[PDB]
Amino acid sequence: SKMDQLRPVLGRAGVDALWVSAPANVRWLSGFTSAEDGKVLVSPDGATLYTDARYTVQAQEESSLPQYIARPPATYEHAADTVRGLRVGFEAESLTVAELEDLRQAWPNSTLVALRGTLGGLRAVKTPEEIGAIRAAQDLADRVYTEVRPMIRAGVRELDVAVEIETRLRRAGGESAFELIVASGPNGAKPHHASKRVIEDGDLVTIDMGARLGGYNSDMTRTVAVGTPSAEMKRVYDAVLEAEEAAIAAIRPGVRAADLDKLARDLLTRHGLGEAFAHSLGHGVGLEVHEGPGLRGTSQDVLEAGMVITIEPGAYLPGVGGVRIEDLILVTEDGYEVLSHSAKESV
Amino acid sequence: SKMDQLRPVLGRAGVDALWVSAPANVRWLSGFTSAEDGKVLVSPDGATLYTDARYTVQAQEESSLPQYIARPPATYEHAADTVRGLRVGFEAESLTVAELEDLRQAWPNSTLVALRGTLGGLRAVKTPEEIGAIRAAQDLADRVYTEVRPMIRAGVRELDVAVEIETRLRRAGGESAFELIVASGPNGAKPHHASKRVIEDGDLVTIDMGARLGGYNSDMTRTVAVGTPSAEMKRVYDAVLEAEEAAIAAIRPGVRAADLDKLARDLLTRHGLGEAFAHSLGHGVGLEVHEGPGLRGTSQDVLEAGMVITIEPGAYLPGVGGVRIEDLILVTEDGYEVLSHSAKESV
Ligand code: NA
Ligand code: NA
């Protein structure tokens, strides 16, 4: 029914067909797992996966769409017959200008229509299979975080904590989902990863990590104390945890993403941290680490059952320290389920 | 003098200015190391790095170009005054259609000109500083390969060899430059990394790896025997090594890239492997793992001193095994220098 829903979405967008080039959307539509080397045409006649003959067996095993096996430009030249006379959308935030020129030459009797975000709303609600995959990725992340966290102590390099997490994710058959952040002391205030800095007694340490497993992602963030933090950084931590648990507890179908953001910013302001926080509270997670919906104050997104999102308030005191705490949340029919189960400690 | 050369290149391309969006070319032009978050305008008035105020200090420390500090769209709106009346090239293989539309709106009195490969020839010849950086990356790769290679023996998973290489690269302050290949037995024939397969007595094992360090890349490939290979796979290995050393020995300023490719394909044919080899012999390496020049049979590239390229014949017997051997080569004023120093073994 994802494909059942897409052609009406295309009609609402004013097009008859869609050339799908973003790798995550090629994979979402077809099941093909080397999607950088595939493209999909959705048309009034059906939907076809285009990929080359190095992928013949893989694509036959994986793809829920019929395959046309060729290299570019034979793929979209062959497609040209299907799109004669039509308005063909393409993904303007993905397709390069050179690729557009190539399609324009191949499809002289079509009108190419630049579209933005066309599949983003459909990707936001996950199927049961996708939720299972995300649970497995987050379970791997929780296992490795829980195994590694005891190593976080005075004298350890940030980089070495990241290396240990990455090693265990990869040995398990997954991978770190994005560049791992291990930020101690004043590095916890910085907007921009894991440096060679040695963790010091008294520091908070923020660990931002996720696993990619089976093409699906997870995402959590934890902050922990090494020794006894300053009273100030303890207040920051406790406020950020307060904000995170309050925003999570408001998740339900129909809540506006922007109203979740407002709840967290109001709480941080009340706790004297109202100019210290980041400007988005969270994002969807799935085939990409960052995807829809978006939880900014300007968001028009409305949560519904089946979405998977992060909730991540933070507060940063430049030159001093900072705290982020984040969980991965499934929206359910009548509330939420927290998927990230690693401990959240006191400090 | 790289910038001294670029404006004449633009003139030959028929444009007055260039909007540089590809991260490697932003970094190449400016020195800025978070180049996904910078853009460069080259214009008749000069060259400017555009980035946001989170990078103020970093960009002042790193950039050889003056900085205009803003977020998009203020960056290219501010630039609009500079490009009034001009033909402005952009990088058509990098810029998305949405980004082009954004520039078209901002620059209504300019003509936007789609260009391909504009900076690729200038990037191909490295400066002394860049050669130093590439040597350091390849030296790190050689150290880690040499440390890890003794672990390659019967009973070991391919994945575990890759994990060990990645762990050591990261702990040293670098990173694996691309998805590491450790391909044993019949996996050595496959076109498409490091699986959970257990290496078997009698297998050849192909290790394709590089380090990224300081923004510069390296690249080598080795094949080694575990135990005694079949006579057949020994013939394949010896032929591929013969081809690699012969092609390397023909490198000098003025040699045509396509003629190096022909030398290797003719040698593999003579050794009964003339339908088993890949269709490019090698590529440049620098800020990206794969960059110009290109060593295909159709290449028009001519090597010159200062280029850094791979030479990588291979031969694959599907269902059976395969061999690739690759070194990283600096073209010198009167020959070549092999930068990758790890042992090449007999089998
Ligand atoms: Na996170
Ligand atoms: Na290689």
Coordinates of C-alpha atoms in Angstrom, one line a residue, chain B:
Chain B
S1 CA 49.4 29.4 -8.9
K2 CA 46.5 27.0 -8.8
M3 CA 44.2 30.0 -8.6
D4 CA 46.5 31.8 -11.2
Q5 CA 45.7 28.9 -13.6
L6 CA 42.0 28.7 -12.8
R7 CA 40.7 31.9 -14.3
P8 CA 42.3 31.1 -17.7
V9 CA 40.7 27.7 -17.4
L10 CA 37.3 29.5 -16.9
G11 CA 37.9 31.7 -19.9
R12 CA 38.6 28.6 -22.0
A13 CA 35.3 27.2 -20.7
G14 CA 33.4 30.3 -21.8
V15 CA 32.5 31.7 -18.4
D16 CA 33.5 34.7 -16.3
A17 CA 33.0 33.1 -12.9
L18 CA 32.5 29.7 -11.2
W19 CA 30.3 28.8 -8.3
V20 CA 32.2 25.9 -6.5
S21 CA 30.0 23.6 -4.6
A22 CA 31.7 20.2 -4.7
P23 CA 33.2 19.8 -1.2
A24 CA 36.6 18.5 -2.4
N25 CA 36.9 21.6 -4.7
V26 CA 35.9 24.0 -2.0
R27 CA 38.6 22.5 0.2
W28 CA 41.1 22.4 -2.7
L29 CA 40.6 26.1 -3.5
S30 CA 40.4 27.5 0.1
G31 CA 42.0 25.2 2.6
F32 CA 38.7 24.9 4.5
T33 CA 38.3 21.5 6.0
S34 CA 34.6 21.4 6.7
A35 CA 33.9 22.0 3.1
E36 CA 30.5 20.4 2.9
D37 CA 29.5 23.6 4.8
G38 CA 31.4 26.1 2.5
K39 CA 31.1 27.3 -1.0
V40 CA 33.5 29.3 -3.2
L41 CA 32.8 32.0 -5.8
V42 CA 35.6 32.6 -8.3
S43 CA 34.9 35.8 -10.1
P44 CA 36.7 38.6 -12.0
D45 CA 36.9 40.4 -8.7
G46 CA 38.6 37.6 -6.7
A47 CA 37.6 34.5 -4.8
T48 CA 35.5 34.3 -1.7
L49 CA 34.8 31.5 0.8
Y50 CA 31.1 31.5 2.0
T51 CA 30.4 29.7 5.3
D52 CA 28.4 30.3 8.4
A53 CA 29.3 31.8 11.8
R54 CA 29.7 28.5 13.5
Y55 CA 32.9 28.3 11.4
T56 CA 34.2 31.8 12.0
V57 CA 37.4 30.9 13.8
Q58 CA 38.0 27.7 11.9
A59 CA 37.7 29.5 8.5
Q60 CA 39.9 32.4 9.6
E61 CA 42.6 29.9 10.6
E62 CA 42.3 27.6 7.5
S63 CA 41.1 29.7 4.6
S64 CA 43.5 31.2 2.0
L65 CA 40.5 33.2 0.6
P66 CA 38.6 36.0 2.2
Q67 CA 35.4 34.9 4.0
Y68 CA 31.8 36.1 3.8
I69 CA 30.1 34.7 6.9
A70 CA 26.3 34.0 6.6
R71 CA 24.0 31.0 6.0
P72 CA 22.4 30.3 2.7
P73 CA 20.6 32.0 1.0
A74 CA 22.3 35.2 2.2
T75 CA 25.6 33.8 0.9
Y76 CA 24.7 33.7 -2.8
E77 CA 22.3 36.7 -2.5
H78 CA 25.3 38.7 -1.3
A79 CA 27.3 37.2 -4.2
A80 CA 24.7 38.3 -6.7
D81 CA 26.2 41.9 -6.9
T82 CA 29.6 40.4 -8.0
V83 CA 28.1 38.3 -10.8
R84 CA 25.7 40.8 -12.4
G85 CA 26.0 40.6 -16.2
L86 CA 28.3 37.6 -16.1
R87 CA 28.3 34.0 -17.4
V88 CA 28.7 32.0 -14.1
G89 CA 29.7 28.4 -14.5
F90 CA 28.6 25.9 -11.9
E91 CA 29.6 22.3 -11.3
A92 CA 26.8 20.3 -13.0
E93 CA 27.9 17.0 -11.7
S94 CA 27.7 18.3 -8.1
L95 CA 25.0 20.9 -7.9
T96 CA 21.5 19.6 -7.4
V97 CA 18.6 20.9 -9.4
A98 CA 17.1 22.5 -6.4
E99 CA 20.4 24.3 -5.7
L100 CA 20.5 25.5 -9.3
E101 CA 16.9 26.8 -9.0
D102 CA 18.0 28.7 -5.8
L103 CA 20.9 30.3 -7.7
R104 CA 18.7 31.1 -10.7
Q105 CA 16.3 33.1 -8.5
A106 CA 19.2 34.9 -6.7
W107 CA 21.0 35.8 -10.0
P108 CA 18.4 36.9 -12.5
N109 CA 20.9 39.1 -14.3
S110 CA 23.5 36.4 -14.8
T111 CA 23.7 33.5 -17.2
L112 CA 24.2 30.2 -15.4
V113 CA 26.4 27.8 -17.4
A114 CA 26.5 24.1 -16.7
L115 CA 30.1 22.8 -16.7
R116 CA 31.5 19.3 -16.2
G117 CA 35.0 18.5 -14.8
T118 CA 36.2 22.1 -14.8
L119 CA 38.6 21.7 -11.9
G120 CA 39.5 18.0 -12.6
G121 CA 42.6 18.7 -14.6
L122 CA 43.9 21.2 -12.0
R123 CA 43.4 18.8 -9.1
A124 CA 45.3 16.1 -10.9
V125 CA 48.8 17.7 -10.4
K126 CA 49.6 17.9 -6.7
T127 CA 51.6 20.5 -4.9
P128 CA 54.5 19.5 -2.7
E129 CA 52.3 20.0 0.4
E130 CA 49.7 17.7 -1.0
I131 CA 52.2 15.0 -1.9
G132 CA 53.5 15.2 1.7
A133 CA 49.9 14.6 3.0
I134 CA 49.4 11.7 0.6
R135 CA 52.7 10.1 1.7
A136 CA 51.6 10.4 5.3
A137 CA 48.3 8.7 4.6
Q138 CA 49.9 5.9 2.6
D139 CA 52.6 5.5 5.3
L140 CA 49.8 5.0 7.9
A141 CA 48.1 2.5 5.6
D142 CA 51.4 0.6 5.1
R143 CA 52.1 0.5 8.9
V144 CA 48.6 -0.8 9.6
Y145 CA 48.6 -3.4 6.8
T146 CA 52.0 -4.6 7.8
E147 CA 50.9 -4.9 11.5
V148 CA 47.6 -6.7 10.6
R149 CA 48.7 -9.1 7.7
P150 CA 50.1 -11.8 10.0
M151 CA 46.5 -12.3 11.3
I152 CA 45.4 -13.4 7.8
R153 CA 45.3 -17.2 8.1
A154 CA 42.9 -20.1 7.9
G155 CA 39.9 -19.9 10.2
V156 CA 39.7 -16.0 10.3
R157 CA 36.7 -14.1 9.0
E158 CA 37.2 -11.6 6.3
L159 CA 35.2 -9.1 8.4
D160 CA 37.6 -9.5 11.3
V161 CA 40.6 -8.6 9.2
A162 CA 38.7 -5.4 8.0
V163 CA 37.7 -4.6 11.6
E164 CA 41.3 -4.8 12.8
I165 CA 42.5 -2.5 10.0
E166 CA 39.7 0.0 10.6
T167 CA 40.4 0.0 14.4
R168 CA 44.1 0.7 14.0
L169 CA 43.5 3.5 11.3
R170 CA 41.0 5.2 13.6
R171 CA 43.1 4.9 16.8
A172 CA 46.0 6.5 14.9
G173 CA 43.8 9.6 14.1
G174 CA 42.9 8.6 10.5
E175 CA 40.1 6.6 9.0
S176 CA 39.6 3.9 6.4
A177 CA 39.4 5.8 3.2
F178 CA 36.6 3.7 1.6
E179 CA 34.7 0.5 2.4
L180 CA 37.5 -2.0 3.0
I181 CA 37.6 -5.1 0.9
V182 CA 39.0 -8.4 2.2
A183 CA 38.0 -11.0 -0.3
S184 CA 39.0 -14.7 0.1
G185 CA 38.6 -17.7 -2.2
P186 CA 35.7 -17.3 -4.6
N187 CA 34.9 -13.9 -3.0
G188 CA 38.1 -12.7 -4.8
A189 CA 36.3 -13.1 -8.1
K190 CA 33.3 -10.9 -7.1
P191 CA 32.9 -7.4 -8.5
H192 CA 30.9 -6.2 -5.5
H193 CA 33.6 -6.0 0.4
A194 CA 34.6 -7.9 3.7
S195 CA 32.0 -10.6 4.5
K196 CA 31.7 -13.1 7.4
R197 CA 33.3 -15.8 5.2
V198 CA 36.0 -17.8 6.9
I199 CA 39.3 -17.9 5.1
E200 CA 40.3 -21.4 4.0
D201 CA 43.7 -23.1 3.6
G202 CA 44.5 -22.8 0.0
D203 CA 42.8 -19.5 -0.5
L204 CA 44.2 -16.3 -1.9
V205 CA 43.0 -13.2 0.0
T206 CA 42.7 -9.8 -1.6
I207 CA 43.0 -6.7 0.7
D208 CA 42.0 -3.4 -0.8
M209 CA 42.4 -0.5 1.6
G210 CA 43.4 3.1 2.0
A211 CA 43.8 5.6 4.8
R212 CA 42.3 9.1 4.9
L213 CA 44.5 11.4 7.0
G214 CA 44.5 15.2 7.1
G215 CA 41.9 15.3 4.3
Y216 CA 44.2 13.3 1.9
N217 CA 43.8 9.7 0.8
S218 CA 45.9 6.7 0.0
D219 CA 45.0 3.5 -1.8
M220 CA 46.7 0.1 -2.3
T221 CA 45.7 -3.5 -2.9
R222 CA 47.5 -6.7 -2.0
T223 CA 46.8 -10.4 -2.5
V224 CA 48.4 -13.0 -0.2
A225 CA 48.2 -16.8 0.0
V226 CA 47.0 -18.8 2.9
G227 CA 48.7 -22.1 2.5
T228 CA 49.3 -23.4 -1.0
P229 CA 47.0 -22.1 -3.8
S230 CA 46.0 -24.1 -6.7
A231 CA 48.4 -24.0 -9.6
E232 CA 45.7 -22.1 -11.5
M233 CA 45.3 -19.4 -8.9
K234 CA 49.1 -19.1 -8.7
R235 CA 49.2 -18.5 -12.5
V236 CA 46.6 -15.8 -12.1
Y237 CA 48.5 -14.1 -9.2
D238 CA 51.8 -14.2 -11.0
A239 CA 50.3 -12.8 -14.2
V240 CA 48.6 -9.9 -12.3
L241 CA 51.8 -9.1 -10.5
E242 CA 53.7 -9.2 -13.9
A243 CA 51.1 -6.8 -15.3
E244 CA 51.2 -4.4 -12.4
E245 CA 55.0 -4.1 -12.4
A246 CA 55.1 -3.7 -16.1
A247 CA 52.5 -0.9 -16.2
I248 CA 54.2 0.9 -13.3
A249 CA 57.6 0.8 -15.1
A250 CA 56.1 2.7 -18.1
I251 CA 55.0 5.7 -16.0
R252 CA 56.7 9.0 -17.0
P253 CA 55.6 12.5 -17.9
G254 CA 54.0 12.4 -21.4
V255 CA 52.9 8.7 -21.4
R256 CA 49.2 8.4 -22.4
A257 CA 47.0 6.8 -19.7
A258 CA 45.3 4.7 -22.4
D259 CA 48.6 3.3 -23.5
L260 CA 49.3 2.1 -19.9
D261 CA 45.9 0.4 -20.0
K262 CA 46.8 -1.2 -23.3
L263 CA 50.1 -2.5 -21.9
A264 CA 48.4 -4.3 -19.1
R265 CA 45.6 -5.7 -21.2
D266 CA 48.0 -7.0 -23.8
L267 CA 50.1 -8.7 -21.0
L268 CA 47.1 -10.3 -19.4
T269 CA 46.0 -11.6 -22.8
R270 CA 49.4 -13.1 -23.4
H271 CA 49.1 -15.0 -20.1
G272 CA 45.6 -16.4 -21.0
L273 CA 43.7 -13.9 -18.9
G274 CA 42.5 -11.5 -21.7
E275 CA 38.8 -11.6 -20.9
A276 CA 39.2 -11.7 -17.0
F277 CA 40.5 -8.1 -16.3
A278 CA 38.7 -4.9 -15.2
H279 CA 38.2 -2.1 -17.7
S280 CA 40.2 0.7 -15.9
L281 CA 43.8 0.2 -14.9
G282 CA 43.7 3.0 -12.3
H283 CA 42.8 6.5 -11.2
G284 CA 44.1 9.6 -9.5
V285 CA 44.0 9.9 -5.7
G286 CA 44.0 13.0 -3.6
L287 CA 41.3 14.8 -1.7
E288 CA 39.1 11.9 -3.0
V289 CA 39.9 8.2 -3.4
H290 CA 38.8 8.3 -7.1
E291 CA 39.7 11.4 -9.1
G292 CA 41.6 12.3 -12.3
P293 CA 43.3 11.2 -14.3
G294 CA 41.6 8.0 -15.5
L295 CA 43.4 5.0 -17.0
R296 CA 40.8 3.4 -19.3
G297 CA 41.4 2.4 -22.9
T298 CA 39.5 5.4 -24.0
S299 CA 41.2 7.9 -21.8
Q300 CA 42.6 11.1 -23.3
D301 CA 44.7 11.8 -20.2
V302 CA 48.4 12.4 -20.5
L303 CA 50.5 11.9 -17.3
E304 CA 52.6 14.7 -15.9
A305 CA 54.9 15.2 -13.0
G306 CA 53.0 15.6 -9.7
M307 CA 50.1 13.4 -10.5
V308 CA 49.4 10.5 -8.0
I309 CA 47.7 7.5 -9.5
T310 CA 46.9 3.9 -8.8
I311 CA 47.9 1.0 -11.1
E312 CA 45.6 -2.0 -10.5
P313 CA 45.3 -4.8 -13.0
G314 CA 43.2 -7.7 -11.9
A315 CA 41.9 -11.0 -13.2
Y316 CA 38.8 -12.8 -11.9
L317 CA 37.6 -16.4 -12.5
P318 CA 33.9 -16.4 -11.3
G319 CA 33.1 -19.1 -8.8
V320 CA 36.8 -19.8 -8.3
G321 CA 38.9 -16.8 -7.3
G322 CA 40.6 -13.6 -8.4
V323 CA 43.6 -11.4 -7.8
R324 CA 44.1 -7.6 -7.7
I325 CA 47.4 -5.9 -6.9
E326 CA 47.7 -2.2 -6.7
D327 CA 50.3 0.4 -5.9
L328 CA 50.1 4.2 -5.4
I329 CA 52.5 6.0 -7.7
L330 CA 53.9 9.5 -7.9
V331 CA 54.8 10.7 -11.4
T332 CA 58.1 12.4 -11.2
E333 CA 60.1 14.7 -13.6
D334 CA 61.8 11.7 -15.2
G335 CA 59.9 8.6 -14.1
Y336 CA 57.9 7.5 -11.1
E337 CA 58.2 6.8 -7.4
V338 CA 56.1 4.0 -5.7
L339 CA 54.6 5.5 -2.6
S340 CA 53.0 2.3 -1.3
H341 CA 55.7 0.2 0.3
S342 CA 54.0 -2.8 1.8
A343 CA 55.5 -6.1 0.7
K344 CA 54.2 -7.9 -2.4
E345 CA 54.6 -11.6 -1.6
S346 CA 54.9 -14.6 -3.8
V347 CA 52.2 -17.3 -3.6

